[PDB]
Amino acid sequence: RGSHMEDFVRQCFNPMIVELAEKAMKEYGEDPKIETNKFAAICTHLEVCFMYSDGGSKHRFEIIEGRDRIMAWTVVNSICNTTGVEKPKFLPDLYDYKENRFIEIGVTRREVHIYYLEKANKIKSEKTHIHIFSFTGEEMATKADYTLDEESRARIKTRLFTIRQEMASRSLWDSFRQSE
Amino acid sequence: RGSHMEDFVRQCFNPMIVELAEKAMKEYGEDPKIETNKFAAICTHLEVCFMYSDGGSKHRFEIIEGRDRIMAWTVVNSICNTTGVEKPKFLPDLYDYKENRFIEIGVTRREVHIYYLEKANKIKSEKTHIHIFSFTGEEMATKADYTLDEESRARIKTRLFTIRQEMASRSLWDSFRQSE
Amino acid sequence: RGSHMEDFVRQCFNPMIVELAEKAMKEYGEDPKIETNKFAAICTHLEVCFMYSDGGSKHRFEIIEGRDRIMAWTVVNSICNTTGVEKPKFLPDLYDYKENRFIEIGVTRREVHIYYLEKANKIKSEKTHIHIFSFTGEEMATKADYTLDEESRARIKTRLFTIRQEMASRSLWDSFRQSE
Amino acid sequence: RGSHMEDFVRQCFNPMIVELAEKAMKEYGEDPKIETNKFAAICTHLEVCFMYSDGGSKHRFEIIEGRDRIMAWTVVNSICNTTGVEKPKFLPDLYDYKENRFIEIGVTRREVHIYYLEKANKIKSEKTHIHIFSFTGEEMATKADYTLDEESRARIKTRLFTIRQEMASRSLWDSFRQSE
Amino acid sequence: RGSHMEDFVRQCFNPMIVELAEKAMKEYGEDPKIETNKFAAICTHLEVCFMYSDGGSKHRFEIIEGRDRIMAWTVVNSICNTTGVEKPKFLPDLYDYKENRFIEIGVTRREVHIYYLEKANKIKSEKTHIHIFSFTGEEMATKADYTLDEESRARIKTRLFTIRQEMASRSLWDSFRQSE
Amino acid sequence: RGSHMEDFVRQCFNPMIVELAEKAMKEYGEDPKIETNKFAAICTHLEVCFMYSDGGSKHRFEIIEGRDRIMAWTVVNSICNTTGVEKPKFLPDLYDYKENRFIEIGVTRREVHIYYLEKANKIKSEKTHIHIFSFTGEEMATKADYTLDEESRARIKTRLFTIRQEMASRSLWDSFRQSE
Amino acid sequence: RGSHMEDFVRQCFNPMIVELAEKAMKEYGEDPKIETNKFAAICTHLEVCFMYSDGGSKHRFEIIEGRDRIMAWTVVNSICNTTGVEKPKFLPDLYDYKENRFIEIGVTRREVHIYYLEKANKIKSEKTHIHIFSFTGEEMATKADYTLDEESRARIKTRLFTIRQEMASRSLWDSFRQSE
Amino acid sequence: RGSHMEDFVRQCFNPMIVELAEKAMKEYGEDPKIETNKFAAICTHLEVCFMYSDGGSKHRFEIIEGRDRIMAWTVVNSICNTTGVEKPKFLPDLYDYKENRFIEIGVTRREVHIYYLEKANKIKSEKTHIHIFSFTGEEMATKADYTLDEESRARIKTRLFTIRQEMASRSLWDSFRQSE
Ligand SMILES: COc1cc(CCNC(=O)c2nc(-c3ccccc3C)[nH]c(=O)c2O)ccn1
Ligand SMILES: COc1cc(CCNC(=O)c2nc(-c3ccccc3C)[nH]c(=O)c2O)ccn1
Ligand SMILES: COc1cc(CCNC(=O)c2nc(-c3ccccc3C)[nH]c(=O)c2O)ccn1
Ligand SMILES: COc1cc(CCNC(=O)c2nc(-c3ccccc3C)[nH]c(=O)c2O)ccn1
Ligand SMILES: COc1cc(CCNC(=O)c2nc(-c3ccccc3C)[nH]c(=O)c2O)ccn1
Ligand SMILES: COc1cc(CCNC(=O)c2nc(-c3ccccc3C)[nH]c(=O)c2O)ccn1
Ligand SMILES: COc1cc(CCNC(=O)c2nc(-c3ccccc3C)[nH]c(=O)c2O)ccn1
Ligand SMILES: [Mn+2]
Ligand SMILES: [Mn+2]
Ligand SMILES: [Mn+2]
Ligand SMILES: [Mn+2]
Ligand SMILES: [Mn+2]
Ligand SMILES: [Mn+2]
Ligand SMILES: [Mn+2]
Ligand SMILES: [Mn+2]
Ligand SMILES: [Mn+2]
Ligand SMILES: [Mn+2]
Ligand SMILES: [Mn+2]
Ligand SMILES: [Mn+2]
Numbered sequence A, B, C, D, E, F, G, H: 001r002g003s004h005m006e007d008f009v010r011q012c013f014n015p016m017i018v019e020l021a022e023k024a025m026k027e028y029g030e031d032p033k034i035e036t037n038k039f040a041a042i043c044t045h046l047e048v049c050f051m052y053s054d055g056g057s058k059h060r061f062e063i064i065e066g067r068d069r070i071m072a073w074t075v076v077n078s079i080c081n082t083t084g085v086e087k088p089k090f091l092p093d094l095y096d097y098k099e100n101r102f103i104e105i106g107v108t109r110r111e112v113h114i115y116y117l118e119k120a121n122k123i124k125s126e127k128t129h130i131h132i133f134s135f136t137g138e139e140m141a142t143k144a145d146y147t148l149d150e151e152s153r154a155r156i157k158t159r160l161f162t163i164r165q166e167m168a169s170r171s172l173w174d175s176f177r178q179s180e
């Protein structure tokens, strides 16, 4: 093809993030060269998940997102058959060994209130913790339990607003927002 | 030869783990290409020991397992002639500088209760701490003192159940369980 | 799934070869975990192509195989619009800057005579050079022009027979041969 | 040219520090080969900023100094539009996620009291924290809040006095002091 | 700013090429973020020079392009005061130790005949060899002496046409051609 | 020459430790090939100092030992002119930023009581803290303030007894002990 | 144990050479700590083989020595079933793709004439080329065909005499010579 | 001390060159901080020797310069007891396996004719080849046999004149020339 968004995504995100996002879309029958808005979203969600796991202790989180579907479900079964928690219907993003619960990370271009409403509607397993971030700097989690420290979450939202600025500077933000 | 277990072991474990396990069996007159079930067990026990030492403080543990028999006993003598603890009859796996005791790590495919019964029967030195893990997610230690934090131990059992799933997915689990 | 061939492929070939083969099959809607015979073939063809380009001078060959379909065709157009050769109907494997022709590399489990007959039947552009290798140690090229030196080609066939031996040692050769 | 200060700067500071300082001066139309005193000052200020961020927690500080003017302001806007603090008139050096304020780092060859008087006079945004260091071993911060621990600040001043000694040993300190 | 050409340049060329081009423009008071067409040209000319020096023997070429103006002239003086050749009026790109002459590399978007006419008009020192490349695949050198082997030059023009295709695929080729 | 001690020292200690010890002896007009007992002692003292600084916080210690005499004294002057402590008569080994004092590390083959008696007799500056270790597992520090945690010191003495065992295993311990 | 030869071997040879020699002896039920003379010989023979393969073209030699017995025989079968040469009775050291023959490398402490007499007596396959080196600087090969260039062989014998000097300098040469 | 020459030497030469030169002077009881002119000369002679060995084939030269006095003489004895050449009275710089002779490399600030006259007067062994270079671009060797190709020698003299220019640019050339 030849989109501005694709070149910006490769310039904005770490190369391993781009490769993992490409593998995730190709596993789900998606092309980064055509669905470039989803390409930027999957890269953003990937980085947010990794910065999230970077916060806290060393052995606190088990990273579910970023693995292939078979191995991700294998780790989920291992975590469930070990601690005793219920197997979630859909694949979560992380598992907290400190709080003993799965975490679903969300990144939205609209109000954080609407996304969780759809995220909580889909996620039937109420045990799975939900934590939403927005590109405007807002966040909200289940039971107001934000899991990480304030500084780690502040670093996440700062990065999100930086991605938003870089997108608007090259005039891809408008098409990126009205596409979720 | 040409066993499925040998190729799975090389694909499942870190290369340095495989090399250390090979050296340990060859030091005891064992061939990984024929005794592939023991090959997978020595790799599993090696990784569990290293994840165990990864938990806790930086200078907490001295790693006895993974060294050659002569150097491992040299470190054991050094630890004994320093702190003043009794020299164990058999080589332990770790030494805890925080609790001032040797640690014997066990990984079992049967009930954790039976192994320790044999492990405690062999280990005459009652000072040596014993900590057993199972592939089903169970654990138990001497005096109910589990040494590490809950998250580090939970990560160990999750990995053990993942190895069990990968083994059963390729139909090596049955021959691996009824072989201990 | 859980196939012996998949674990052998990951143990036999270089990791970057495995990743490039995975991307090539996923680009063509193929799963390495199910089509493990094709997984071993695409890895073998990939390595043969890279050893082939390793023979000769430094700037002799342009590597077409291993790139994504869009970039591979981009390099082919560049080579054609530069030297003046005709654009081949299908994607070749290499381009020889010394002989000024595209090269199609083939690896077969049957007689080398049959494959080229199908390869030359498909390849309408007679300018594209064809070079076939077999797992038994045979080779043959267009116009009896074998391009590389004898030692580089001998190293290629030696590797092919080593892959064949390792496959038969674990009893995957029979299913691999009667699958082409 | 051919100044002793330029060769000392390249020998005294880390290579990446020298490259970042060169880019900062060239961005502001300055030549390190002629303004060698400013070359040593920008390297010193750069290293002090990086040692400052090295103190404290992992996610505590966002490093503003060292980036290009456009990206530095992009991060500042991100931090402001996230936490809600006021946009400073001039570019600060760091942002504290723990104290929720921007930090302006200063390094002086005169009394620390005079510099801050000029630094606080320029910085209209009173929210921005100011922290001055001197080459004699003195320091002072806004509201007597020195942000970091005593050991991290002591390491900073020790390095500053070491740079001063190395400068005087080669007879560049006198021209470096009477040049601020 | 926010140009498509800038993100494509960072995605198309090697990172060290981009950094060297940035330093060359900033040394001459030029901004890559605004003069993005010149940004792509200086990166292209830089890579062509490095591929050119990559052809031939190990100690054949001395690379003049890519150094700062002071050090580049220092190497030119060294070469002149050693071999005895005349000092060129303007900075050349390479020096051939085999042919004992300086080389001026040119990359053009128009006919190679016009550029050399301007290049030979500017270069008063007739000893300096001139070698022009075009994005269409044409080349021509002084006295029809093309210095390198055919394969090394063919690789250069293939890369040039690949850059041209990638530019046209994202619709920057038209503005890049009508800008020389 | 050709001593067993020299080959054991190179096999027992880290290569950078050996190089730093060689530079220290050559700076004081000493040859490692002839004074091999001192070679083993300077390597042992070097490693103990580095393990000592490895204990505690990140910015706690400034490492004086291991630098050249001029730079070591330069750091000592920097520390003194910063904190305000008195300049010691002889070069110490470390500086504690937490306790604000210099540390003199000693390793002995005799009773720890005798060495400190000579160490405290030489060190006139009573502010400098003294910490002695022995190859038998004993330690003692000024004012019974052992600075580090018990685990870090236990790791130091364990290493010392391991060096003693390796020396006696090759029959260099007797000549090493009766040589201090 | 505690031998001077073992520490000298670890100090004299490259670490990977030492590891490969250890694996070769342990595969044949041999201990480097007790049979230290054989330890030095297997390291010497290993290095000579690798320097030998280092001479000549890039794809000239296939390295048989240094692999495990199963994989070494697998490569030998591949070479035989490819070129058509006869399978040797015992494992050779190299294969020459240029001369199409296996090479048996020998290193001796006695006269080169006696070793080959035993080497040629054992090696029934007359096709296998034999090339002997001595620690005194002598060499001789089958049919006076020395395979490599004079400089590569001269470098091999120079290294052999250097190992001999280092051995005699520490008084292990006498026990090493009267032990073959 | 604090000399301009010392900082220029560390900035001009590769770090390993500086370390090897420091070890050579300290082995001969010389201080780089005081004899900075000799410091620059030993670095220059070291680099010239390494560029000289870089010319030619892979196994052509054995590097004598840069080793410690004991190991350098050990290699010289090995070369003599192997090829059969006479042991030189003083340590040479290289050995040519192609021409079968030792090489003495010289770098001078005066006329190349005078140095060799002293070099040939000292070197009694007429077999040792002598090759002198100057900072003005002149060279001359024994029997007019310049050993290497013209391009490799031209690269050496170009580097020498570059070092001369950098020295004069900072006003150390005059004191460096009138000091030989
Ligand atoms: C939709 O196809 C996929 C599927 C996967 C595997 C699991 N996916 C997630 O877990 C996940 N997906 C999204 C997302 C992103 C873009 C468009 C729509 C959605 C719903 N957002 C999340 O927050 C999140 O956790 C990976 C990548 N793409
Ligand atoms: C049995 O030969 C060996 C010996 C060693 C050295 C010391 N071994 C242990 O310390 C150890 N061995 C086992 C184990 C594993 C497989 C079969 C039987 C046993 C008892 N399990 C442990 O938990 C454990 O600590 C290493 C490897 N193999
Ligand atoms: C078939 O889907 C693909 C397609 C590609 C891209 C281009 N492919 C080739 O160029 C190519 N393909 C084969 C091959 C391998 C397995 C089964 C059938 C065939 C015909 N053999 C070759 O020799 C060869 O050059 C890559 C991978 N898989
Ligand atoms: C003046 O041109 C520049 C500008 C920048 C970007 C932002 N600059 C700072 O933020 C900054 N500048 C100094 C400084 C240093 C030398 C002379 C005068 C001053 C005022 N001192 C600081 O403490 C400080 O934070 C970087 C480099 N040079
Ligand atoms: C014009 O400012 C500069 C100057 C330099 C230093 C030396 N420059 C060259 O040597 C050189 N410059 C060009 C070029 C590129 C874009 C626009 C105009 C020109 C004439 N083309 C070449 O072929 C070439 O050799 C580096 C970068 N920019
Ligand atoms: C003897 O046990 C082994 C066996 C192997 C595998 C194959 N061995 C050889 O190929 C080989 N062995 C020697 C050698 C060395 C010491 C003592 C006796 C001999 C005969 N010398 C060679 O030249 C040579 O090629 C490796 C190591 N040790
Ligand atoms: C003089 O002390 C040393 C000795 C060595 C070991 C062997 N030295 C040489 O081989 C050598 N020495 C010089 C040189 C350099 C400066 C002043 C005087 C001389 C004669 N010039 C050479 O060309 C040369 O080959 C290394 C370093 N310094
Ligand atoms: Mn997810
Ligand atoms: Mn999610
Ligand atoms: Mn054990
Ligand atoms: Mn155990
Ligand atoms: Mn193909
Ligand atoms: Mn093909
Ligand atoms: Mn600033
Ligand atoms: Mn500042
Ligand atoms: Mn130019
Ligand atoms: Mn040019
Ligand atoms: Mn000391
Ligand atoms: Mn001390």
Ligand SMILES: [Mn+2]
Binding pocket: G065, G091, G092, G093
């Ligand atoms: Mn052999």
Ligand SMILES: [Mn+2]
Binding pocket: G045, G093, G104, G105, G106
């Ligand atoms: Mn042999």
Ligand SMILES: [Mn+2]
Binding pocket: H065, H091, H092, H093
């Ligand atoms: Mn010399």
Ligand SMILES: [Mn+2]
Binding pocket: H045, H093, H104, H105, H106
């Ligand atoms: Mn010389």
